[PDB]
Amino acid sequence: VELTDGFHVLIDALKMNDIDTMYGVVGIPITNLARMWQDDGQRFYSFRHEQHAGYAASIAGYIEGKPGVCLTVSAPGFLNGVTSLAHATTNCFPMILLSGSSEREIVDLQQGDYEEMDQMNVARPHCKASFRINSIKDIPIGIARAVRTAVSGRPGGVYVDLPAKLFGQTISVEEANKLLFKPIDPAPAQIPAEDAIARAADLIKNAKRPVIMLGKGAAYAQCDDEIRALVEETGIPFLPMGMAKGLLPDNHPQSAAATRAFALAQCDVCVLIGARLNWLMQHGKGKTWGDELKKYVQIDIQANEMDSNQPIAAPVVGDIKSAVSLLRKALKGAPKADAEWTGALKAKVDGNKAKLAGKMTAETPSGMMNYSNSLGVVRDFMLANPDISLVNEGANALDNTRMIVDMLKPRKRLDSGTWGVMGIGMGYCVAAAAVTGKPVIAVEGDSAFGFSGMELETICRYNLPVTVIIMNNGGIYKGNEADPQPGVISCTRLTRGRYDMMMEAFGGKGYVANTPAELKAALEEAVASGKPCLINAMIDPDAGVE
Amino acid sequence: VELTDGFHVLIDALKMNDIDTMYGVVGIPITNLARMWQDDGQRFYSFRHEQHAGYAASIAGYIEGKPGVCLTVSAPGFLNGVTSLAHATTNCFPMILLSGSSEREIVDLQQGDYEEMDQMNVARPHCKASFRINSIKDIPIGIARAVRTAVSGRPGGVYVDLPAKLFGQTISVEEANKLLFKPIDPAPAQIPAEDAIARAADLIKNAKRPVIMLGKGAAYAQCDDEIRALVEETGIPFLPMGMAKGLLPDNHPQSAAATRAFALAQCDVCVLIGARLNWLMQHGKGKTWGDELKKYVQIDIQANEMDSNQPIAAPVVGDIKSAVSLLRKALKGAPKADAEWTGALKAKVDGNKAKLAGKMTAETPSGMMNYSNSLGVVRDFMLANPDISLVNEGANALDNTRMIVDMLKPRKRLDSGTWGVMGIGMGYCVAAAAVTGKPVIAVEGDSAFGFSGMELETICRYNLPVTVIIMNNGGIYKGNEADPQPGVISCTRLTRGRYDMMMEAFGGKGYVANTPAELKAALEEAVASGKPCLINAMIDPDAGVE
Amino acid sequence: VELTDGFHVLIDALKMNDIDTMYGVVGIPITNLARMWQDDGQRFYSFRHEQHAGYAASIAGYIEGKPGVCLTVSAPGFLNGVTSLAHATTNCFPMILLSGSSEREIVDLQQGDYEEMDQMNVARPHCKASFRINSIKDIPIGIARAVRTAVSGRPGGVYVDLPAKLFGQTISVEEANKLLFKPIDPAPAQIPAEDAIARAADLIKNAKRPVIMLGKGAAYAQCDDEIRALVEETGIPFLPMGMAKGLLPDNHPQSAAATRAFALAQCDVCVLIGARLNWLMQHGKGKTWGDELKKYVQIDIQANEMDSNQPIAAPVVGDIKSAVSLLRKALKGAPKADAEWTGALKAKVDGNKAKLAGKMTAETPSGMMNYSNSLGVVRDFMLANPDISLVNEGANALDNTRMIVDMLKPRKRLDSGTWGVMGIGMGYCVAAAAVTGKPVIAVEGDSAFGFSGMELETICRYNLPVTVIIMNNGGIYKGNEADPQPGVISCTRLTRGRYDMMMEAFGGKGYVANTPAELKAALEEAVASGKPCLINAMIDPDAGVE
Numbered sequence A, B, C: 001v002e003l004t005d006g007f008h009v010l011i012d013a014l015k016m017n018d019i020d021t022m023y024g025v026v027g028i029p030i031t032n033l034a035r036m037w038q039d040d041g042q043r044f045y046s047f048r049h050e051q052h053a054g055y056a057a058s059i060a061g062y063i064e065g066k067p068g069v070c071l072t073v074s075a076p077g078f079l080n081g082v083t084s085l086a087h088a089t090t091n092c093f094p095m096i097l098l099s100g101s102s103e104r105e106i107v108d109l110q111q112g113d114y115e116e117m118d119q120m121n122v123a124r125p126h127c128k129a130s131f132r133i134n135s136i137k138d139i140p141i142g143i144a145r146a147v148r149t150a151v152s153g154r155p156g157g158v159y160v161d162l163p164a165k166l167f168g169q170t171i172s173v174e175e176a177n178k179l180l181f182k183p184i185d186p187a188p189a190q191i192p193a194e195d196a197i198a199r200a201a202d203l204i205k206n207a208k209r210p211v212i213m214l215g216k217g218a219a220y221a222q223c224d225d226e227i228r229a230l231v232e233e234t235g236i237p238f239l240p241m242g243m244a245k246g247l248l249p250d251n252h253p254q255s256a257a258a259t260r261a262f263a264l265a266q267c268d269v270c271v272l273i274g275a276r277l278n279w280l281m282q283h284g285k286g287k288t289w290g291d292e293l294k295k296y297v298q299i300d301i302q303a304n305e306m307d308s309n310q311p312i313a314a315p316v317v318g319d320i321k322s323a324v325s326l327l328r329k330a331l332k333g334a335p336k337a338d339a340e341w342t343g344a345l346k347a348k349v350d351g352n353k354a355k356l357a358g359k360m361t362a363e364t365p366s367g368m369m370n371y372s373n374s375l376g377v378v379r380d381f382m383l384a385n386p387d388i389s390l391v392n393e394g395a396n397a398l399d400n401t402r403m404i405v406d407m408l409k410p411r412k413r414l415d416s417g418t419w420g421v422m423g424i425g426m427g428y429c430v431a432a433a434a435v436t437g438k439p440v441i442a443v444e445g446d447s448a449f450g451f452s453g454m455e456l457e458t459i460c461r462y463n464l465p466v467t468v469i470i471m472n473n474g475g476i477y478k479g480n481e482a483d484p485q486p487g488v489i490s491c492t493r494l495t496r497g498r499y500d501m502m503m504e505a506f507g508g509k510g511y512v513a514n515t516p517a518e519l520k521a522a523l524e525e526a527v528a529s530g531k532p533c534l535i536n537a538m539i540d541p542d543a544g545v546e
């Protein structure tokens, strides 16, 4: 007798799968879905462009271990969001893009429907799976397939097409209750066999110059104690990848990060934990590895990732928590790494660390700070306040921040990722604030910032505790490239604008820092105020390198 | 032996195909191509996001008749640009997307190369053709293929992949000069057969209530007088589609735009010229067409476009200039349309315009204008200053502007188009200014603006004569939607921001207009100044509709 | 300096991954690869059409557990092979399709190269992964990637594009030998967590009417005794799917195959082992399941396969051998299934078998046998000669054979599979004979046979011990459909041909069987002879159903 509709069944299916937040932009034909979602008591963050709603979704998935959800309209909105879905998939971040689509009959004949596109098809190369839910009765199963696909195996993006006709369909309330359900164990553990473990243990026990590489896959796994115990019990030196920073504290005694180049070229046994031997690792080839094939151990949940670049002497397939637990049990009681090895690296590290300290104390003209002395301030602040998310992107602004700013806690550093994407900054800030409930600090190149800058309005609209630091050097890499022809500005130039004024235009707080002292003062006040702020840090136009 | 590189051969090939402008964002691996393009005396507009450089290229193609060129980096940059390429293809705008790509060997084995992606195949569904130039000796033929594909037949987007190793290749100048060539007649005329024209002439002579529909395809054709000649000599009323406004002066005596519903519902014969019977026309059925199959004449360059929605009684395939010329000749001497038909429509138009006049005169509280009295100011300005491009996007801001602002010149109005895209705004402004060398006015909803607002900095960087008018009502459709839940802002709400301050943050001029008089004074000074300006028009948060 | 070419490095890489057999068709540009493969002492089976070489490779992968390899030429040859690759992926059979391709430069510009096609991207939707090997130094890693992708996780097809220029490349033997390697543990075990197993144990101990469903995934796993052990120790009745027949002797006391409808409709708990809840099982709903959601246990290596059709109460993800072992241990000591449940089913089976016995005994006119008395002969032969592969395809010829012919050994029955494909017949015969070195019998409908009949010549060319039994009823389903119009043959009709003569045309032995006794004598002599034979069984044109 009593009926319910597509809108409500979808809302119930999402809540059923523990989804309480969605990021997106409204309009035909999903505006009423967002309203009812809010009316129902769940939260919806509206952005100014779908790409950045999608970037927020992708990083929410990385932080929480459950698919971040992005909602968009058809055709052009879908396309904007699919670019972020592709980013999630290459980064192995669980994410679900939900998009409304037009009429099946008109689209299938290419007659020119409103926002016409076979979105399901277009999405295929950018996600793990692309589905379409045509019937109200299939909503629970549909959402279940999406969640399982996004979080199981190698996590990634999933596209779910929602035809406009779906929302208006009806079904008896009694019937709808038989259909709704909660999937059991959507992200199962996958334990490797003992002989696989035994093989890796032996390579490790017999290594002379061993090293452990931690990738963001390890950080994602959320088994920080297992990995920390492994590193300290074996006494092996470790190197963290960009987003693996903080898994163990960056200033940990066993960190060989400060002497990476040397540690890699000299090691004989390299243990890869949730890290791909891709471009970020020079593919295991080149002088960075002393022009020789190392004996690799690799732990990854994706079986065919093994031998993708170089032969892997000890492949260990399964989830990181299960595998590390077994590897520790196999190495229990074995002698720690050789002191001459671990000692020769620490020495190197101390040298570089002392040298870096040398640049951070250097003086500069007002409004002409360089990367070392400006970032040194952020470094000191983060060490004192590690429970804050650090968003970071750019070129000089990225590489230097990764070198200078120490992370003491895991899953706090959120950067450009595998594709070296410019544009994740602001979306990453909304998601980090929304899912952590703690402050966020974003170190942005001024070029990188431009890709998502309008979202400052979103940060202000939701009054998030985000402090955006713009490394304003006036351009890409450098801010002083000469005019190619008299009267024409170089393509790498950017207006050394008042981004602080832009922030205030939407209700935020803005600062302008010309020296390390002003930067520190502004940063401390900004973060403590709990208000959305922007610090326009003036960097020497020539301080950067290409 | 005098040698040359890939960079230069490509630059020469582009120049030979009459390209002298490129829109894009630099970085690995095409920064030097952009640099040398500039050194060579050609112009490159650097944007803050590739999607906008792409929208710029698409409209440049529309306005000029030659493909607009967008240049981007690999993977993520290319993806941002391809969203714009898809928009161009959908609207039939000539465009070429040039993107650098990575190493073939690494990408083909999916080993995790820098910015890895098979861009050539990812672009397939979004363009007319997707090519890749691997050898320096093939650059001349590749660019020629790209250009021809973009402008011939139904114009559209084309993707050209440029692997990094292409640029470094060398070849002797002698051989290079022997390969370089300019295609002959890239966009050839295609003349329809005599019977196709006679079939159309027949339907028109026997029409009791004929009407002409002009689409943007007609405007793109650039045969404004032939079309106007055909219209006047036949005495048949006409209706222009969104961007066809101005093909014939909007205030032309034969225009039935002010009574579209009655004209389309009561007509017996409808002549479509460069216009598709898609969603914009309710697919030629339903209440809007009186519920019966009219006898359609259609002139279009795409043969299989015929019978896509409704049976076409007189299909005329070929380029519009060639078709209209022959049709005009076939109708010379024939009796003009029925005066009792043309008279009834005229009376309807005069009636409705008088009705709109009363609205534009309405008085409103300061900071609370509605869409009639605010846009009435733009209307008057555009009637006095016809030679200005008008960019327009939004919902209420789009519909009301299309209805209120009369265009007196062709190809000046540039809006959301076929896909009703939000985000074309600022990109269109740059290209329009760039290719016309005249002033541009943009009427933007505040939500629409957010999709490309950061590019305001680009507009300032190039000191372009662009005036952006924000229809600030505070949200999507309306800015007063009540909190779905206490303390929770509705997903349709946007901050009623000081966009004027954002503009001034980059060196532009900002204004706030609370009344029609202030808007008028502001608009007149902004356009006259010839500098980058933004007018924050304060609209009643409850004036628009859903 | 001793050099080597692409041909040889590839040959070595294949041999290193334990491949010693290839199925294909030669021509430009891979004729010499096949030649040298043979010179090297490896075997190559040349077929009359690539599609059949591909089906051969797919079943070789199923039977052995290592990818079957198919070799083809460019464009059209590759397309014929990819249809088979799609079939392998759908059925989860490990397979690698190696195809030569043309010139990158010409194809990438779509200039009309010899056999032009971007084969790598055309194969995308039909396989787990599509790679291309452009450099000789990458052959070792490429083949390793292909093999791992094919056998790990859910087994499937993989495409490897080999551009013509690959083979001509040279490299020193020293370096070549330094690159060649054999992957470690390509198909790793994946063990499920303790709670996943306990959840399953729980449902089974509380079941009042349990049933086990064995799919071909279980058979492919090759852990026949573990499965049989779990079945006997639990006393739970089982039902095998098409190719799972023989995993446990079909005449095993606990089999409920002879009363499937009642077992599936009346069960309360259903344990799926390497079997999907797809169309073959009515998607776990409707009349066949009594119209209620049973409590499903599922063991599968593909995590996102769970909840694909119906909610899975106890999902157990991991490889079947590892899962069944742990489950068996978790159930040891538990009470066997309800005797009043197992007893009722048994009585149903004995009843129906007796009923089938009477049919097989039925007498028929010469040249007009039905499906029972003809297949009853095959049944008896297969019970006496269990170690023979049985290929089977058709409609009535498939359904009746599946029901009548009992299999006593595992992985012997090879049929149409998941897609109900006609045309697997003759290809399966070649591979089965090739990898088993034992006799093969094929029960083919006459229509099904036509899809691969020309390969009879291939079977004769290699003097393989294959006996093909044609169920000659004269058409699709039936061979007596009346002329739709006078003198016009019905589209379901086929000539009641002398297929025996076709076989003898290529040197094979042909027989015609008009009665069960003649079929019996013919079958016994054909198999015993060990030569290629075909038996033309004359079936009543009106015996089958629609």
Ligand SMILES: Cc1ncc(Cn2c(C)c(CCOP(=O)(O)OP(=O)(O)O)sc2=O)c(N)n1
Pocket: A393, A394, A395, A396, A397, A398, A419, A420, A421, A422, A423, A444, A445, A446, A447, A448, A449, A471, A473, A475, A476, A477, A478, A544, B025, B026, B027, B028, B073, B076, B077, B080
């Ligand atoms: C979407 C996209 N577009 C373009 C690029 C190319 N690119 C761009 C545009 C960079 C910006 C460098 O400028 P910045 O202001 O961010 O930093 P520094 O000046 O501090 O180096 S770094 C880089 O690789 C990219 N990575 N992603």
Ligand SMILES: Cc1ncc(Cn2c(C)c(CCOP(=O)(O)OP(=O)(O)O)sc2=O)c(N)n1
Pocket: A025, A026, A027, A028, A073, A076, A077, A080, B393, B394, B395, B396, B397, B398, B419, B420, B421, B422, B423, B444, B445, B446, B447, B448, B449, B471, B473, B475, B476, B477, B478, B544
């Ligand atoms: C890329 C994209 N995303 C979302 C939409 C949905 N949408 C959106 C977000 C509109 C904006 C309406 O708000 P506005 O401020 O632009 O105008 P008014 O308030 O004046 O109506 S109109 C519309 O169809 C779209 N067309 N394109």
Ligand SMILES: Cc1ncc(Cn2c(C)c(CCOP(=O)(O)OP(=O)(O)O)sc2=O)c(N)n1
Pocket: C393, C394, C395, C396, C397, C398, C419, C420, C421, C422, C423, C444, C445, C446, C447, C448, C449, C471, C473, C475, C476, C477, C478, C544
């Ligand atoms: C490649 C392909 N084409 C067509 C079909 C359709 N089809 C066809 C053509 C069948 C043949 C039935 O005739 P038969 O002679 O093989 O068997 P019976 O007459 O003994 O039933 S069964 C069936 O589903 C198919 N399954 N696969």
Ligand SMILES: Nc1ncnc2c1ncn2[C@@H]1O[C@H](COP(=O)(O)OP(=O)(O)O)[C@@H](O)[C@H]1O
Pocket: A090, A091, A092, A154, A155, A214, A215, A216, A217, A218, A220, A221, A241, A242, A243, A244, A274, A275, A276, A278, A280, A299, A300, A301, A302, A305, A318, A319, A320, A321, A417, A418
């Ligand atoms: N829970 C998990 N257990 C094991 N491996 C995982 C898990 N989650 C993700 N992975 C793997 O982590 C790896 C991360 O690699 P990558 O993104 O390159 O990290 P990085 O850029 O820091 O080196 C991927 O191969 C992914 O399959």
Ligand SMILES: Nc1ncnc2c1ncn2[C@@H]1O[C@H](COP(=O)(O)OP(=O)(O)O)[C@@H](O)[C@H]1O
Pocket: B091, B092, B154, B155, B214, B215, B216, B217, B218, B220, B221, B241, B242, B243, B244, B274, B275, B276, B278, B280, B299, B300, B301, B302, B305, B318, B319, B320, B321, B417, B418
């Ligand atoms: N030169 C030309 N001659 C004839 N037809 C053309 C020419 N250029 C473009 N066209 C056609 O113009 C049509 C434009 O349709 P559309 O974009 O729907 O316009 P609108 O939205 O204004 O109705 C397309 O079908 C395109 O094929």
Ligand SMILES: Nc1ncnc2c1ncn2[C@@H]1O[C@H](COP(=O)(O)OP(=O)(O)O)[C@@H](O)[C@H]1O
Pocket: C091, C092, C154, C155, C214, C215, C216, C217, C218, C220, C221, C241, C242, C243, C244, C274, C275, C276, C278, C280, C299, C300, C301, C302, C305, C318, C319, C320, C321, C417, C418
């Ligand atoms: N070694 C394995 N361990 C667990 N599951 C496997 C293994 N190999 C294959 N599978 C699974 O076997 C299943 C077979 O399903 P299907 O082909 O539908 O069989 P059937 O048609 O006999 O029911 C697939 O879901 C596949 O993932």
Ligand SMILES: [Mg+2]
Pocket: A445, A446, A447, A471, A472, A473, A474, A475, A476, A477, A478
């Ligand atoms: Mg910069």
Ligand SMILES: [Mg+2]
Pocket: B445, B446, B447, B471, B472, B473, B474, B475, B476, B477, B478
């Ligand atoms: Mg608005």
Ligand SMILES: [Mg+2]
Pocket: C445, C446, C447, C471, C472, C473, C474, C475, C476, C477, C478
């Ligand atoms: Mg038949």
